[PDB]
Scaffold this active site. Sequence first.
Site, PDB file in Angstrom:
ATOM      1  N   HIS A 115     117.487   7.238  65.068  1.00  0.00           N
ATOM      2  CA  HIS A 115     118.940   7.137  64.979  1.00  0.00           C
ATOM      3  C   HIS A 115     119.525   6.161  65.993  1.00  0.00           C
ATOM      4  CE1 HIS A 115     118.794  11.425  63.104  1.00  0.00           C
ATOM      5  NE2 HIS A 115     118.610  10.489  62.191  1.00  0.00           N
TER       6      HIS A 115
ATOM      7  N   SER B 272     118.358   2.288  60.376  1.00  0.00           N
ATOM      8  CA  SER B 272     117.339   1.884  59.421  1.00  0.00           C
ATOM      9  C   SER B 272     117.325   0.370  59.254  1.00  0.00           C
ATOM     10  CB  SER B 272     117.575   2.551  58.067  1.00  0.00           C
ATOM     11  OG  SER B 272     117.447   3.957  58.166  1.00  0.00           O
TER      12      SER B 272
ATOM     13  N   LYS C  65     121.068   9.653  45.494  1.00  0.00           N
ATOM     14  CA  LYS C  65     119.910   8.784  45.315  1.00  0.00           C
ATOM     15  C   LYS C  65     118.637   9.479  45.779  1.00  0.00           C
ATOM     16  CE  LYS C  65     118.102   4.167  46.260  1.00  0.00           C
ATOM     17  NZ  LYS C  65     117.999   3.096  47.288  1.00  0.00           N
ATOM     18  N   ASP C  66     118.716  10.231  46.878  1.00  0.00           N
ATOM     19  CA  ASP C  66     117.565  10.990  47.345  1.00  0.00           C
ATOM     20  C   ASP C  66     117.407  12.304  46.597  1.00  0.00           C
ATOM     21  OD1 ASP C  66     116.672   9.154  49.251  1.00  0.00           O
ATOM     22  OD2 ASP C  66     118.015   9.948  50.793  1.00  0.00           O
TER      23      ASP C  66
ATOM     24  N   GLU D  48      87.164  14.754  50.349  1.00  0.00           N
ATOM     25  CA  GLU D  48      88.382  14.639  49.558  1.00  0.00           C
ATOM     26  C   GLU D  48      88.817  13.183  49.428  1.00  0.00           C
ATOM     27  OE1 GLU D  48      90.093  15.930  47.566  1.00  0.00           O
ATOM     28  OE2 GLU D  48      90.253  18.110  47.755  1.00  0.00           O
TER      29      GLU D  48
HETATM   30  C1  HEM Z   1     104.113  12.814  58.438  1.00  0.00           C
HETATM   31  C2  HEM Z   1     105.373  13.188  58.203  1.00  0.00           C
HETATM   32  C3  HEM Z   1     106.557  12.200  58.324  1.00  0.00           C
HETATM   33  C4  HEM Z   1     107.839  12.533  58.141  1.00  0.00           C
HETATM   34  C5  HEM Z   1     108.393  13.931  57.792  1.00  0.00           C
HETATM   35  C6  HEM Z   1     108.648  11.355  58.334  1.00  0.00           C
HETATM   36  C7  HEM Z   1     110.017  11.289  58.235  1.00  0.00           C
HETATM   37  C8  HEM Z   1     110.746  10.127  58.194  1.00  0.00           C
HETATM   38  C9  HEM Z   1     112.039   9.941  57.572  1.00  0.00           C
HETATM   39  C10 HEM Z   1     112.857  11.019  56.832  1.00  0.00           C
HETATM   40  C11 HEM Z   1     112.401   8.674  57.760  1.00  0.00           C
HETATM   41  C12 HEM Z   1     113.692   7.997  57.263  1.00  0.00           C
HETATM   42  C13 HEM Z   1     113.288   7.118  56.084  1.00  0.00           C
HETATM   43  C14 HEM Z   1     114.079   5.842  56.089  1.00  0.00           C
HETATM   44  O1  HEM Z   1     115.189   5.813  56.678  1.00  0.00           O
HETATM   45  O2  HEM Z   1     113.579   4.846  55.512  1.00  0.00           O
HETATM   46  C15 HEM Z   1     111.351   8.004  58.494  1.00  0.00           C
HETATM   47  C16 HEM Z   1     111.347   6.682  58.878  1.00  0.00           C
HETATM   48  C17 HEM Z   1     110.280   6.018  59.438  1.00  0.00           C
HETATM   49  N1  HEM Z   1     108.991   6.507  59.545  1.00  0.00           N
HETATM   50 FE1  HEM Z   1     108.417   8.468  59.243  1.00  0.00          FE
HETATM   51  N2  HEM Z   1     107.806  10.305  58.634  1.00  0.00           N
HETATM   52  C18 HEM Z   1     106.510  10.779  58.637  1.00  0.00           C
HETATM   53  C19 HEM Z   1     105.395  10.009  58.894  1.00  0.00           C
HETATM   54  C20 HEM Z   1     105.394   8.712  59.363  1.00  0.00           C
HETATM   55  C21 HEM Z   1     104.215   7.924  59.641  1.00  0.00           C
HETATM   56  C22 HEM Z   1     102.760   8.408  59.466  1.00  0.00           C
HETATM   57  C23 HEM Z   1     104.597   6.723  60.079  1.00  0.00           C
HETATM   58  C24 HEM Z   1     103.610   5.599  60.477  1.00  0.00           C
HETATM   59  C25 HEM Z   1     104.020   4.463  61.049  1.00  0.00           C
HETATM   60  C26 HEM Z   1     106.051   6.694  60.088  1.00  0.00           C
HETATM   61  C27 HEM Z   1     106.874   5.649  60.462  1.00  0.00           C
HETATM   62  C28 HEM Z   1     108.219   5.543  60.168  1.00  0.00           C
HETATM   63  C29 HEM Z   1     109.079   4.415  60.466  1.00  0.00           C
HETATM   64  C30 HEM Z   1     108.636   3.112  61.164  1.00  0.00           C
HETATM   65  C31 HEM Z   1     110.311   4.698  60.029  1.00  0.00           C
HETATM   66  C32 HEM Z   1     111.558   3.790  60.128  1.00  0.00           C
HETATM   67  C33 HEM Z   1     111.688   2.949  58.863  1.00  0.00           C
HETATM   68  C34 HEM Z   1     112.876   2.033  58.973  1.00  0.00           C
HETATM   69  O3  HEM Z   1     113.526   2.014  60.047  1.00  0.00           O
HETATM   70  O4  HEM Z   1     113.176   1.323  57.983  1.00  0.00           O
HETATM   71  N3  HEM Z   1     106.495   7.929  59.646  1.00  0.00           N
HETATM   72  N4  HEM Z   1     110.356   8.924  58.746  1.00  0.00           N
END
Ligand code: HEM
Lengths: 106, 32, 54, 62, 81, 379
Positions: F201, F205, F227-228, F271
Amino acid sequence: AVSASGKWLDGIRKWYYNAAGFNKLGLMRDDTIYEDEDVKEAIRRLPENLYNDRMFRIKRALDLNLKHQILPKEQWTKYEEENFYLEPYLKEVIRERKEREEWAKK
Amino acid sequence: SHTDIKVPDFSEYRRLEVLDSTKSSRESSEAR
Amino acid sequence: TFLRWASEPEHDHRKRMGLKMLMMMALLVPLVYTIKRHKWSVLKSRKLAYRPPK
Amino acid sequence: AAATLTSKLYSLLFRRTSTFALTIIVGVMFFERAFDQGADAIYDHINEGKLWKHIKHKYENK
Amino acid sequence: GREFGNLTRMRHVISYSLSPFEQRAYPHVFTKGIPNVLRRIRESFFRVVPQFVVFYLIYTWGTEEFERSKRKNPAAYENDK
Amino acid sequence: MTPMRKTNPLMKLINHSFIDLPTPSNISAWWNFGSLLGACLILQITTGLFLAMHYSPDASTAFSSIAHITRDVNYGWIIRYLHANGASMFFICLFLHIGRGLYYGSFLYSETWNIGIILLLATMATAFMGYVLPWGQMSFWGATVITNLLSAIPYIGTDLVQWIWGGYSVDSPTLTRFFTFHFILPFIIAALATLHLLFLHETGSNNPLGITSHSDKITFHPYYTIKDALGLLLFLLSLMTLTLFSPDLLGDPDNYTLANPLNTPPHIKPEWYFLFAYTILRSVPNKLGGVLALLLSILILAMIPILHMSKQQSMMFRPLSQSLYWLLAADLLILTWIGGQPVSYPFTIIGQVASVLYFTTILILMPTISLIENKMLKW
Ligand code: HEM
Ligand SMILES: COC1=C(OC)C(=O)C(C/C=C(\C)CC/C=C(\C)CC/C=C(\C)CC/C=C(\C)CC/C=C(\C)CC/C=C(/C)CC/C=C(/C)CC/C=C(\C)CC/C=C(/C)CCC=C(C)C)=C(C)C1=O
Ligand code: HEM
């Protein structure tokens, strides 16, 4: 200097420029650069008119990307008309950082 | 001047009932 | 056939629920997409203009 | 010239959100029965004879 | 910087929009929608597809070679006699 | 007179995160999987909680317990299948959630990107210990192989393996601790997910274009909610179709036979979501080499931000980088396919070539082409 190689270099660069799609949205080259702290300060030094133009073209590009549309052919940016307006400012900022770092080590 | 501004035509997107700029939209409101 | 049952006695019930799921999705997916388009229309039709002082 | 069906449905029901909710839940009550019965009939019609409820006749009441 | 009140500083821009109830949810989805999708697909076809075709060729040959290996060898039995 | 969601502390958080969150308007579907991941987690949790009310974590009654769930417990079969099938959906969304950041350059958000790496490892552990719970042939032997992989440590080795096992082999004590760890970790992942969103935050994004979106930000409540909400409906459609029509497609038989310490099936493949790493291991003859490879694999994700050299975030404007990206994806597909095949001449050589190609592309080719593209743009 080399003529055929230089013309080939110009041709391939023009081909790459057309392959990149930012001209399709009216964007100039300097608009796509990643905005790091150096770029942030450089933008802060722009005159109002260039800054205003930059913001509007970014808005139009975002708006077009919203609806997955493309700007008409006639309005695409051309390889020869582009102006690298941001180059002088970014160069000065980078040089200043180098001078500061060079002093800082001794 | 602020008076040169005029809204561009949205006719393409408008609903069939409100295409023309002559009939009132009040009656179609409940339907739409 | 008897063995296939003994390893899966929820066969008939599983497929009945699948049938209902398919029809329910057919009704729902277009409906939800319509609502999405309805709300997003205001953004998809937006028009912009740039009027500097000259 | 008759007022459109949707317009009448709006003024009487959809205008007030409380009535909008009331009609929704009554529709759920009715649609649930209708949808369930229709789907079950279709499923049985696809597999006449296979389902055991159609086989009870050959052996029942001793 | 995180509140809509103060994010950026823009000037000399205008916007026009219509209400959701005053416009169609599927406008020109037959004459203007499909062609745009076709443009999208065509513009990025050669950048993706061909590589995955190579994957398919590698996959088919592999399976073929694997089975080809399990076939009995007539050259290991001609002299066995 | 003023809105009540701007005074109550519990409503301030919800207003910040959900209702009045400034979000770019041009984000595509790729930005939906984030939400879906959490949704899937919320599903798994509830589905598993109901399965726990009838599961006996003992080596002599675990298998019989599951058989009883699917034949005597009201709608037990659907609950079990939803849990199993919902795990595969988790990974699918997770791989697509990571691919988006790789393509669009979201890794530049150091804090958020690093938290994700931790979340990935935590989820991987949760899925492995869950898969051993049924106590089938594959479950028993898969744990044995993966647990014996710590013997490669130079001087400690056996001590960790015997410590984890609670004995000289895999038996009931191992099952019980895994059951407890399986239960607890998902709740730990929830806390990590909140930290993930926390650091996000502060910046916001990233749009597909990679340019600052501060001029075209919109609220989240009316637009991205629906949308979501449409994405989640599609997610459920896929999950329910898998469960109600092909309950056993992404699984493997021999999990329906009681585990036998003496007998061992030939292929004993793990798996599908743990297959690409499996091939990387087998590609290197040495045990220490293989384990280092597995680890070095995940570590690359942490090093990717350091390897970035282009002056742009998104690869949308860099077609050569795009082609390399898709070749890398195809290489991962080959790795997965090889993992599913027996050990033989063609597969072994192909796996080695895929593994070396994987590493070389990330560590060598991507930075070089990025500099080349900077040259043709007269940067
Ligand atoms: C495993 C459970 C995970 C949950 C519940 C989760 C949750 C979230 C959510 C809800 C968002 C917002 C999506 C958006 O605004 O595009 C987000 C963004 C993001 N996630 Fe996760 N995530 C997970 C795993 C991961 C993993 C494995 C990575 C590996 C790099 C990751 C990296 C990111 C990044 C970089 C963003 C920001 C994307 C942007 O700023 O455009 N997340 N995450
Ligand atoms: C065979 O098959 C299998 C696999 O496959 C081979 C597998 O895997 C696995 C899976 C299992 C494993 C590896 C086990 C993994 C671990 C577990 C289950 C444990 C689960 C639990 C956890 C990690 C939780 C414990 C930790 C907790 C709560 C940590 C909480 C701390 C934090 C939030 C603080 C960290 C905060 C932030 C943002 C991230 C880090 C800190 C930051 C500020 C950002 C850091 C970065 C920077 C500032 C950037 C620096 C700068 C710049 C440019 C780059 C600098 C570069 C340089 C080179 C200097 C299995 C089972 C398997 O069977
Ligand atoms: C991200 C979170 C989770 C993931 C990825 C996950 C994954 C899995 C998987 C793949 C299985 C084996 C499925 C099969 O063999 O068909 C399993 C089994 C199980 N899990 Fe989890 N799980 C999660 C959360 C939970 C939680 C919170 C609980 C709480 C009780 C739980 C309880 C169980 C139980 C009881 C089983 C036994 C399955 C059976 O008896 O058939 N799971 N889990």
